[PDB]
A = this chain, B = another copy of it.
Amino acid sequence: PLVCLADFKAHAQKQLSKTSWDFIEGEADDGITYSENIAAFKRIRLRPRYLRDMSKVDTRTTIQGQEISAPICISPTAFHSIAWPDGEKSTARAAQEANICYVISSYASYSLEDIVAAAPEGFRWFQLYMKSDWDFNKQMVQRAEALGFKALVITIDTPVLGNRRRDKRNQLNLEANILKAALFPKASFCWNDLSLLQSITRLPIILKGILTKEDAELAMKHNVQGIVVSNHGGRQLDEVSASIDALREVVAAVKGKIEVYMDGGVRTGTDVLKALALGARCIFLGRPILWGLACKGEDGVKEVLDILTAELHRCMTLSGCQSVAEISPDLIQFSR
């Protein structure tokens, strides 16, 4: 059976074509950051406190004032139908049942209307890649607001697509019709455009992809409502810091002014625990959601969310943290 996220990764590869698997992996260039996102979590050491009453451990928290069952949410990932026919509809149903936040990608296989219809009461954010035509941008954000999306995520680390060698080999070998059956390119978007976007929507803006204290400071000066510390899973600029390492300087720059989240390499409960101890308000999952879909559709996504939540509950119990508010830097060895 599939008892951890790694089992879903292994089984998903068996259930997908080489081209689809290579797209879901997608490491850029030499693949240094893809590996370091995991290794950077593994080298952090935990300091547990024992003999505390852990009879009741609570994993709930809030993001942007909305309660969620655990600080484990879904990062924006394109094309869910590559993994499961029902695609984002399956993801939306699982996310609503789990009571977490689902960030829908700007390149979903299904329309926003069809995704919302699959799970009307789900908590969702929308990640939109802006275009040159601001008439389209305005219409899209107004559409998202009409459909009940609660925040807009602007991903800033993809002005051009990363250089993923396996995808490129696969593409030069096969016709687009088979590669996509069974281009982008936004480099001009800048802080100027962010301010304009903020002026046309009442939805809070969350910037995804920040890795430096300098960009975190600019984000705060532009009055955004949150930041997802992320290196896009090592799929964009490679040889940048692991996201769990970049989190430290972003949190130190922000000093609690706005919520800071992260994604990249979260696979087990202690990874979630470490991100929370280092200052993140919640983590987001990229590839594990696609592995869940590829293995079992809606039930696979739900199982991935449930397993990671159970692992977080277990390590909070073992480490002595009764609730998310009790997870602090004291848990981290020299770092903290």
Q: Among the listed stretches A40-48, A60-68, A121-129, A145-153, which one makes contact with chain B, having 4 or more residues with CB under 8 Å of it?
A: A40-48
Top 4 nearest A-B pairs by Cβ distance? A237-B318, A54-B187, A50-B156, A1-B172
Indicate whether A183 reaches chain B with its CB closer than 8 angstroms: no
Contact B214 A49 (CB under 8 A): yes
Give the segment of A12-20, A98-106, A159-167, A291-299 that binds chain B.
A159-167
Chain A, residues 233-277, CB within 8 Å of chain B (1/0): the string is 000111111000000000000000000000000001110000000
B215 touches A54 (CB 8 A): no
Interface residues as binary, A156-180 with B (CB distance below 8 Å gives 1, 0 otherwise): 1101101101001100110000000
Given the contacts A4-B165, A187-B55, A160 and B49 also touching, CB distance less than 8 Å: no
Return the chain B residue nearest A163 by Cβ.
Answer: B314
A55, closest chain B residue (CB): B188
Bound form: Cα–Cα A197–B189 in Å: 54
Contact between chains at A169 and B241 (CB < 8 Å)? no
Q: Which residues of A contact B (CB under 8 A)?
A: 1, 3-4, 6-7, 29-30, 32, 42, 44-55, 57, 156-157, 159-160, 162-163, 165, 168-169, 172-173, 187-191, 193-194, 209-212, 214-215, 218, 236-241, 268-270, 311, 314-315, 317-319, 333
Contact among B190, B241, B268, B315 for A52, CB-based, below 8 A? B190
Instruction: For the complex, give the distance between the alpha carbons of A190 and B54 in Å.
Output: 9
Total identical chains: 4
For the complex, what is the distance from the CA of A165 to the CA of B236, rounded to whole Å?
A: 32
B162 in contact with A237 (CB, 8 Å): no
**Across-interface contacts of A212 in B (CB, < 8 A):** 47-49
With contact pairs A42-B32, A270-B238 given, residues A48 and B157 touching in the complex (Cβ less than 8 Å): yes
Q: Give chain B residues whose Cβ lies under 8 Å from the Cβ of A168.
A: 1, 3
Q: Which residues of B contact A193 (CB under 8 A)?
A: 51
Please give, as numbers and ranges, the residues of chain B lying within 8 Å of A7 by CB-CB distance.
Answer: 165, 169
- 5 residue pairs of the A-B complex, CB under 8 angstroms, read A29-B311, A32-B42, A42-B239, A50-B157, A162-B318
Q: A237 to chain B: which residues have CB within 8 Å?
A: 46, 48, 270, 315, 318-319
**Residues of B contacting A55 in the complex (Cβ-Cβ under 8 angstroms):** 187-188
- A270 close to B29 (CB less than 8 A): yes
Extra A-B contacts (11), CB below 8 Å, given A30-B42, A187-B317? A3-B169, A30-B268, A44-B239, A45-B239, A47-B240, A49-B215, A50-B209, A55-B187, A55-B188, A160-B317, A160-B318
Q: A39 → chain B, closest Cβ, in Å?
A: 11
Contact of A190 with B53 in the complex, beta carbons under 8 Å: yes
